[PDB]
RNA sequence: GUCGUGCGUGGAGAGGGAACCCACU
């Protein structure tokens with residue numbers, strides 16, 4: 017549903033940059049790796065945590081409830 | 082609570098939310114001090130309220146949390162904000178017909 | 188005591204009463220969460 | 231079936247419009263900012279009002295920046311000119327709603343009553359840790375303070391112990407939210423009321439669903455529909471009108487869509503509206519009349535109270551409802567007020583039981599009042615109000631549809647104001663107004679530069695020629711000599727016997743003439759520090775002396791009840807005039823005399839008019855907004871028999887228009903010199919001053 | 925550079941199978 021609050025591997029907080037990540041992907045039309053590097057993600061654990069996440073919360077909210 | 086998410090899910094997400102702990106040494110464990118009902122001397126109490134209004138689903142962030150307990154001038158328990166936008170850690174999303182009202186004790 | 192799936196409006200119906208929504212013909216008739224205090228832990 | 235469902239959907243969408251974007255945009259503004267624009271965005275974003283709009287989206291895009299600029303300018307004016315009473319509140323729990331934060335605070339009932347805080351008000355909140363409780367608190371402290379946040383009063387709920395739970399909605403991104411700690415004192419002061427702005431924004435958003443959206447965007451009135459001359463002659467005979475007015479009425483009624491009637495003052499424009507209403511009623515249908523100024527609505531209601539004639543000539547009195555509050559509505563038509571009609575229609579354990587019974591009784595009374603109001607609205611055929619008041623929440627909740635809309639003085643309101651009453655499924659709209667009158671009251675010069683001040687009536691007239699009226703029946707021909715020759719360059723013919731019917735006994739006296747100009751030899755005006763409004767007591771004294779002399783000469787010979795009016799451009803000057811008149815004469819001024827402003831007195835009719843020129847000081851070297859020809863035209867077109875202009879010759883002579891007016895008055899020997907007690911033989915000082923000046 | 929404007933609420937006890945379709949060791 018929502019981006020994980022902390023990385024499973026290390027525990028770094030990556031949920032703050034999810035909106036920033038989406039903005040960089042859309043507003044700046046930057047590639048995944050460049051955007052993640054700009055956000056300040058060195059270890060690939062957070063890279064795959066952010067890249068591999070799927071926003072099912074938006075899909076769920078599409079329904080009337 | 083009437084969000085699409087689950088109470089346990091949102092509670093787990095809130096648990097991972099960082100909180101200021103500069104004065105953690107001053108704070109004492111609840112199991113240590115002889116208290117009742119999570120006295121503020123050993124715990125920090127916050128309240129979360131959120132609900133959309135007919136449109137523009139509301140996004141819940143760390144900044145939404147407001148401390149209700151008396152910290153006695155201690156800068157402990159304040160939400161940690163580091164993103165450039167300053168919104169904080171995304172928590173959940175509430176639809177127009179979804180209501181969220183909860184209390185958190187750290 | 189009860190809510191409609193679509194209308195999401197309270198009904199507060201009693202025993203020996205129709206279980207159909209008064210506003211609409213839908214009769215899912217969901218029930219709201221209990222008023223009793225509930226606590227959860229991140230663990 | 232499907233068509234009815236679509237119509238109902240459109241009606242509910244127009245009535246129910248999301249206000250979140252408006253609050254989000256406005257609250258982001260900085261109260262402490264001192265500028266002519268809400269933000270530092272490029273000026274290129276703002277664009278002039280296009281004559282032709284390709285689609286509703288383009289119209290909304292063009293209008294939104296102008297509306298935001300006007301709202302910001304109004305907020306700044308309220309911050310500077312208006313000074314409310316600041317109060318203090320205690321911060322409570324904060325709720326995160328869509329792109330907003332709602333804060334609940336506890337306030338004292340007496341403080342709320344004194345400050346007049348309602349559920350549709352805007353306030354500015356600040357945190358002042360160093361503020362001294364003993365030290366006075368005013369808007370100056372808020373201006374000096376750098377931590378200011380805009381808030382909207384969502385709701386006001388009264389709790390036990392005389393405590394009101396005020397809900398304040400603010401923007402999340404605003405940093406001041408960090409100061410909103412629980413149990414913290416925050417100093418909040420009201421700024422302005424957003425009801426009109428909210429209604430304008432709702433109308434702008436809902437214009438897409440309006441039936442006449444295409445005509446408004448294209449600004450193309452429906453083509454005239456030919457009608458037999460027999461009907462025109464019959465209408466003229468029944469209503470005792472002229473050929474032009476009858477033709478205009480027939481053309482407007484025959485054709486659907488927008489119908490524009492352009493008639494200078496005194497050309498029966500109000501009488502034309504009454505004739506249209508009567509013809510429509512004779513031919514259930516409910517008609518909505520909207521006038522930008524409450525004075526125009528009051529005049530229309532008073533005229534309708536006398537009865538409406540049908541085609542056969544019989545006079546009938548339909549039920550007329552005035553949508554407004556008693557205070558603003560005139561006392562004469564106070565009976566026609568909707569609230570008055572509703573009032574006429576209806577008008578331990580033991581303590582707990584008594585409280586429950588009292589609550590039940592109050593609920594029953596509220597239900598009875600609502601039922602009476604609904605019955606009055608449904609049965610009523612004519613609904614007269616203002617453009618801002620035409621979107622009253624009660625009307626939206628009721629859902630009644632008005633197929634006929636009339637907009638009086640369409641040139642005095644902006645496009646949004648004129649379109650507000652069209653939200654109720656307006657299929658036929660008749661706009662009556664004269665372009666030479668005053669433009670809409672816009673507080674922003676930049677907005678006027680972008681043609682925001684331009685009214686929908688002006689644009690429609692530019693697109694196509696409205697129905698023109700060139701015959702007058704109110705203004706005295708001598709009084710209309712200069713306004714017609716200069717402002718209209720002719721095209722305005724006096725009535726066959728206007729001079730004969732305008733003869734009055736006081737016209738014989740040399741001091742009082744149908745047209746006369748009085749010069750204040752010694753007169754100065756002081757500008758208020760806060761309101762920045764000029765005011766001079768010399769003109770007030772001269773007017774009081776003139777009124778006293780007129781009453782003494784003709785106390786019982788002629789009654790002056792509702793026949794003497796004084797128009798002053800400045801609100802402060804008008805208030806001072808009214809106060810001094812009440813002090814001198816007493817209660818008679820409440821009825822025998824009226825006081826108003828040129829813009830607020832537009833459309834009014836009075837036998838005797840006194841036009842006060844506040845700018846009586848030559849050292850100023852500026853005439854102000856009076857320099858515009860529309861202001862002078864409106865001021866001069868109020869008098870029916872007698873017009874008396876008070877001012878300083880030297881100060882006014884600087885401007886070309888006033889110089890020409892003074893020259894014309896001198897040519898007709900209407901110039902006069904006035905001062906303190908110039909009509910008192912005992913006061914030889916005034917006579918000596920007059921002799922020296924001559 | 926000062927102009928309009930919207931609203932009146934007190935102890936106690938206690939019975940269900942046969943078949944079909946999948947999956948794991």
Ligand SMILES: Nc1ncnc2c1ncn2[C@@H]1O[C@H](COP(=O)(O)OP(=O)(O)O)[C@@H](O)[C@H]1O
Pocket residue numbers: 470471472494495496497498499500501702703704832833834835
């Ligand atoms: N055919 C007519 N015969 C006599 N009087 C008329 C006729 N038509 C109009 N009038 C007079 O002209 C006046 C028109 O006033 P009006 O132009 O409506 O004022 P305003 O321009 O301020 O609205 C009315 O008071 C009415 O008495």
Ligand code: BEF
Pocket residue numbers: 493494495496499639664667832833834864867
């Ligand atoms: F044209 Be009038 F002055 F209303």
Ligand SMILES: [Mg+2]
Pocket residue numbers: 498499500501638833
């Ligand atoms: Mg008129």
Ligand SMILES: [Zn+2]
Pocket residue numbers: 023024025026027028059060061062063
């Ligand atoms: Zn990681």
Ligand SMILES: [Zn+2]
Pocket residue numbers: 110111114115116117119120121122123124
């Ligand atoms: Zn404790």
Ligand SMILES: [Zn+2]
Pocket residue numbers: 191192193194195208209210211212213
């Ligand atoms: Zn239902």
